[PDB]
Design a protein around this ligand. Sequence first.
Ligand SMILES: [Ca+2]
Ligand SMILES: [Ca+2]
Ligand SMILES: [Ca+2]
Ligand SMILES: [Ca+2]
Ligand SMILES: [Ca+2]
Ligand SMILES: [Ca+2]
Ligand SMILES: [Ca+2]
Ligand SMILES: [Ca+2]
Ligand SMILES: [Ca+2]
Ligand SMILES: [Ca+2]
Ligand SMILES: [Zn+2]
Ligand SMILES: [Zn+2]
Length: 616
Amino acid sequence: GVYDYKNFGTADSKALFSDAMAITLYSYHNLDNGFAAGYQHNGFGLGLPATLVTALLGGTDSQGVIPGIPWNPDSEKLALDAVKKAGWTPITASQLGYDGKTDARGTFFGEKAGYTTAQVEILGKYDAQGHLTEIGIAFRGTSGPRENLILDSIGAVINDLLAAFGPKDYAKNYVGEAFGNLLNDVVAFAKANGLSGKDVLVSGHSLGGLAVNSMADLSGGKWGGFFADSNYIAYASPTQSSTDKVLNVGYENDPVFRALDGSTFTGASVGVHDAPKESATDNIVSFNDHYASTAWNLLPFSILNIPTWISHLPTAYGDGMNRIIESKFYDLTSKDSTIIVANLSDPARANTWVQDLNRNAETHKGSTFIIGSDSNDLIQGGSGNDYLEGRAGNDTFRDGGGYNVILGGAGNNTLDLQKSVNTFDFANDGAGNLYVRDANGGISITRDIGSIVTKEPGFLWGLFKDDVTHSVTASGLKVGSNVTQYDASVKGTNGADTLKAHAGGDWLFGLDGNDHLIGGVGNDVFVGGAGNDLMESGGGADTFLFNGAFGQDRVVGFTSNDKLVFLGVQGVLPNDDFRAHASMVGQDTVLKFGGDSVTLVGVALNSLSADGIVIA
Ligand SMILES: [Ca+2]
Ligand SMILES: [Ca+2]
Ligand SMILES: [Ca+2]
Ligand SMILES: [Ca+2]
Ligand SMILES: [Ca+2]
Ligand SMILES: [Ca+2]
Ligand SMILES: [Ca+2]
Ligand SMILES: [Ca+2]
Ligand SMILES: [Ca+2]
Ligand SMILES: [Ca+2]
Ligand SMILES: [Zn+2]
Ligand SMILES: [Zn+2]
């Protein structure tokens, strides 16, 4: 999964991620809620007030109205409800033995000249009995004063901030300077409650995330090395620590995210700075009204251009990246997966296609995941391999080919094919999956797509030009009266079946159980499903399709004109070739995908070509 951390399980990593995001959001106490609400309702045609950028960096004396970012009446009470729902409760100064101040929210403040506006929330997670199990440290970073930030042009101020981080280990040492004594109290408090460092989660966004990275660098180091084993997840940090300790999460079109090389200002710092970084998620796009806009992108991408900072705002971090977490595709992804998140206003959402524009980014690598919203989305895949997720609402997909998985989720969803119905084949396994094979043999596996739209020259037909809408029924594609039939197939049961193809070619669907798929002399498509399936080619130019937790299969009679299609499987990295997944056991080639496997019986490794082993 894209947020896997250290050696935690996939699931444990996600739970950590969500806690990190919860506490991070809390640290801002709903600062961008007014702006995000206006953006969602109205669009970004008005751009972004320079005052929100200074609020992000400098801190605020609040909670009031400095414009044009709206109130926000209920705001700190909603932020606090939400952090608590996510399982966290602010820890008091008194609980810590802390001598210093906390404001009316329970926020602690920096301790040395130059850090006195730095803030941090210290929160605790308690089991059903009232015992502390975990501590959360959420840095809200500043500089701070709200006071050097108006004496210059906003761009000259951003530029100087950025250049000040690297020299004299300022960014590195930041958390030791600001919170060195507080963190000793946290160490004392944690131990008294039987916690060790592994039970401490460290997060923050922005300058907060700079602080997460700074703590990691010092965790060696200071506080008796108590936090050396703590968990560090930074959002939208400009810096990366030198440790291997921090998961650095961010949107790729966030101008602040990765702006420094470690903490080094470079030529890329004030333009596109999308070179891959070990600790960082490098390919998560916020597909927002700015990113979608020709007009907005007339100016070069730069952190010095305030409108670019819309991609930095925390509410969209929360909301979009929680939809990654929630994805049916989540466990196919890895740290650098290309992920396009639908982040558009209501106005733009009605008429803009969410797609990988690859704008202000280095060229994307591997398969593309596109995650919709709970509203009606327009989602367009490319002619590569794409995993399209509609989530709730009535979504419409398009896709330019390749190998794909299209999930429409809740609602009434449609796949617009934008070619003729005659140039595609359709199959249907009776277990909810409808398969679409294109004229180039690219296959999409679809769920919850009730309607297909084709562009008939036409006639076809029939009565109906030009675009025509087919209902997806058990017996085929129904345009009112006519059926466009499903390709010939044999369907099994969820037990162990033996299925036999006809000489003309069949789609063979074993479904669950350990099946025995005996193809014939024709061009068959083998889908063994869950279970450990024995599939024989029988002749022909055959296709073996593997999706999900496909099990430990055996393929017999595999030749040069046959194809293994791996789609929606475990253990794949951007640009994997089969040679990464291949070994030999006697005269058989074994291909492993996480804990799934295909043994090609009596096929020597060296005889295999990448053209008939598609890894999507
Ligand atoms: Ca990376
Ligand atoms: Ca990138
Ligand atoms: Ca949707
Ligand atoms: Ca595609
Ligand atoms: Ca939907
Ligand atoms: Ca079966
Ligand atoms: Ca099976
Ligand atoms: Ca065959
Ligand atoms: Ca063959
Ligand atoms: Ca299987
Ligand atoms: Zn207990
Ligand atoms: Zn057999």
